[PDB]
Design a protein around this ligand. Structure first.
Ligand SMILES: CC(C)[C@H](Nc1ncnc2[nH]c(-c3cnn(C)c3C#N)cc12)c1ccc2c(n1)NC(=O)CO2
Length: 168
């Protein structure tokens, strides 16, 4: 029922909280949870592994059937599939992996997919092992997304750095 609580309001449409996106999905039952996906939808590690494990592998079985018939996504692209027990829908979004040389300009394209949904629970795109500068990813979110986005960042030091840098 989109009952988000305990988020800091950064802008009129962007909110942020130090929390695990899986625990937020369980508490909130959002209409849309965003997965930090890769092009073949292999939900190993990071956000994707955590969401998939919380569905008892249902998300991986559904995603393998999608890829068999439709093929891989593009960097900056997205795919709406079932949200299983975590949300009504899961929006799988592929941000660029700059640790693998993918272009950081495609992070704006990745965030643009959020504009199709009125309200979303999401992670910080291209952060962690994808290698983008997290402060930059937050600025791209704030500049690109017009709909209501609730960012869950599961790392207190990173959350504090993002908040302090934005509040300058
Ligand atoms: C910057 C990070 C703090 C952030 N991670 C997270 N952000 C929010 N909720 C989270 N839950 C978990 C969790 C829950 N259980 N487990 C075992 C995990 C893991 N791993 C992790 C997580 C993050 C955002 C975007 C990402 C990635 N990581 N990593 C990637 O490979 C791709 O893109």
């Amino acid at each position: 029922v989109n009952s988000f609580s305990g988020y800091l309001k950064l802008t009129d449409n962007v909110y942020i909280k130090n929390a695990d996106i899986v625990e937020e999905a369980k508490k909130v039952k959002p209409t849309v949870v965003v997965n930090a996906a890769n092009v073949y939808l292999k939900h190993g590690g990071g956000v994707a592994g955590a969401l998939n494990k919380a569905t008892n592998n249902a998300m991986q079985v559904e995603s393998d059937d999608y890829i068999a018939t439709n093929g891989p996504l593009k960097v900056g692209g997205s795919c709406v599939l079932s949200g299983h027990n975590l949300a009504k829908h899961c929006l799988h979004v592929v941000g660029p992996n700059v640790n693998k040389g993918e272009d950081i300009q495609l992070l704006k394209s990745a965030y643009e997919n959020f504009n199709q949904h009125e309200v979303l629970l999401a992670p910080l795109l291209s952060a962690g092992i994808f290698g983008a500068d997290p402060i930059h990813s937050l600025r791209v979110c704030v500049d690109t997304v017009r709909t209501n986005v609730y960012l869950a960042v599961f790392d207190k030091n990173l959350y504090d750095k993002l908040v302090s840098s934005f509040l300058e």
